[PDB]
Design an enzyme around this catalytic site. Structure first.
Site, PDB file in Angstrom:
ATOM      1  N   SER A 145      -7.218   0.777   2.489  1.00  0.00           N
ATOM      2  CA  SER A 145      -6.415   0.004   3.432  1.00  0.00           C
ATOM      3  C   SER A 145      -6.831   0.297   4.876  1.00  0.00           C
ATOM      4  O   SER A 145      -7.955   0.054   5.232  1.00  0.00           O
ATOM      5  CB  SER A 145      -4.917   0.100   3.154  1.00  0.00           C
ATOM      6  OG  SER A 145      -4.348   1.331   3.482  1.00  0.00           O
ATOM      7  N   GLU A 239      -2.988  -9.217  -4.108  1.00  0.00           N
ATOM      8  CA  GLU A 239      -2.752  -8.599  -2.804  1.00  0.00           C
ATOM      9  C   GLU A 239      -2.599  -9.566  -1.641  1.00  0.00           C
ATOM     10  O   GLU A 239      -3.365 -10.530  -1.506  1.00  0.00           O
ATOM     11  CB  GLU A 239      -3.878  -7.623  -2.466  1.00  0.00           C
ATOM     12  CG  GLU A 239      -3.924  -6.387  -3.348  1.00  0.00           C
ATOM     13  CD  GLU A 239      -4.646  -5.240  -2.650  1.00  0.00           C
ATOM     14  OE1 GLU A 239      -4.226  -4.880  -1.535  1.00  0.00           O
ATOM     15  OE2 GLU A 239      -5.626  -4.713  -3.208  1.00  0.00           O
ATOM     16  N   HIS A 269      -2.037  -3.229  -4.523  1.00  0.00           N
ATOM     17  CA  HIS A 269      -2.661  -2.539  -3.398  1.00  0.00           C
ATOM     18  C   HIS A 269      -3.048  -1.089  -3.714  1.00  0.00           C
ATOM     19  O   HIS A 269      -2.206  -0.283  -4.107  1.00  0.00           O
ATOM     20  CB  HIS A 269      -1.693  -2.592  -2.214  1.00  0.00           C
ATOM     21  CG  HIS A 269      -2.264  -2.070  -0.935  1.00  0.00           C
ATOM     22  ND1 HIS A 269      -3.406  -2.590  -0.366  1.00  0.00           N
ATOM     23  CD2 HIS A 269      -1.841  -1.087  -0.107  1.00  0.00           C
ATOM     24  CE1 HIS A 269      -3.671  -1.940   0.754  1.00  0.00           C
ATOM     25  NE2 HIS A 269      -2.735  -1.025   0.935  1.00  0.00           N
TER      26      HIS A 269
END
Length: 297
Positions: A145, A239, A269
């Site tokens: 991320s 996602e 995620h």
């Protein structure tokens, strides 16, 4: 519909249910730790805390690790939360799969130390590796991320300041756009149990500290990606960040970068976080291990 996936989704929803906007920053950090705390570090994993050019960091490795191959890792958490405490177990899986050492950074988090502190820390750490005799061709950067975006931004920065580039980058559900403009933020809004536009906006405001949301090093969606090493990009099909991974891959290819995108069906995620209890997590990490073995092996 696998029982293992159901269990992961449940852990994710339990966290995602708690109103974070009323929490102190540290309670938000701890809530993340809480979600992941049920999965302990394997007994045979070696760790060491140390400073690398001033950045707090941690060696993490399994038995039989090649001590000359390094996966410099940048954890996710919106540039605001996350740490080796949340990430060390996943990293140990990657380490074992790749047969290398992981060097994970507890890089500077916002709002205490906002953008571009993490990019500075990543460059400091990579310079430390080079100064201590590690070969660029045996080093790869990785991140999830926020950390996934940071991998790209750090790579661009390194090129911009003339450092020999590492052998590869790995991006797991990378976040490359502070403004969350990707269409999947709309279409996957109800499909994604972990991440929504509101939360991303929350993190970006904290990370940016008033700086330009489209700044290339915060949003590498806008960065010059020429000259970057081969990238592996993994992302889940449900996602909201799906289009960040696609946009990164498209931009990288246009820039002449070798980028491989894997869209994993039904995965949430950073599902690799749950590898200890999720087959697909172990499978994805196996793939990462294969990629690293090819690039830095």
């Amino acid at each position: 519909k696998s029982p293992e996936l159901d269990r992961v989704i449940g852990m994710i929803r339990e966290r995602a249910a708690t109103p974070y906007k009323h929490l102190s920053t540290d309670d938000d950090r701890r809530l993340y730790e809480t979600m992941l705390g049920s999965m302990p570090l394997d007994d045979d994993i070696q760790t060491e805390r140390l400073g690398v050019n001033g950045v707090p960091a941690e060696w993490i490795y399994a038995p039989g690790a090649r001590d000359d191959q390094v996966f410099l890792y940048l954890h996710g958490g919106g540039y605001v939360i996350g740490s080796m405490r949340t990430h060390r177990v996943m990293l140990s899986h990657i380490a074992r799969a790749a047969g290398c050492r992981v060097l994970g950074l507890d890089y500077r988090l916002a709002p205490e130390t906002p953008f571009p502190a993490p990019v500075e820390d990543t460059v400091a750490a990579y310079r430390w590796l080079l100064a201590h005799g590690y070969d660029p061709s045996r080093i790869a950067l990785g991140g999830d991320s926020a950390g996934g975006g940071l991998v790209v931004a750090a790579l661009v920065a390194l090129r911009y300041i003339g450092e020999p580039l590492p052998a590869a980058g790995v991006c797991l559900s990378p976040w490359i756009d502070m403004e969350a403009t990707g269409e999947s933020f709309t279409t996957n809004a109800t499909m994604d149990p972990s991440v929504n536009k509101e939360r991303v906006m929350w993190f970006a405001a904290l990370y940016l500290g008033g700086k330009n949301p489209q700044a290339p090093l915060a949003s590498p969606l806008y960065a010059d990606l020429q000259g970057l090493p081969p990238l592996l990009v993994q992302v889940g099909g449900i996602e909201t960040l799906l289009d960040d991974a696609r946009a990164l891959t498209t931009r990288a290819k246009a820039a002449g970068v070798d980028a491989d995108l894997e869209v994993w069906d039904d995965m949430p995620h950073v599902w690799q976080h749950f590898a200890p209890i999720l087959p697909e997590g172990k499978q994805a990490i196996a793939r990462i291990g294969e990629f690293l073995r090819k690039q830095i092996g």
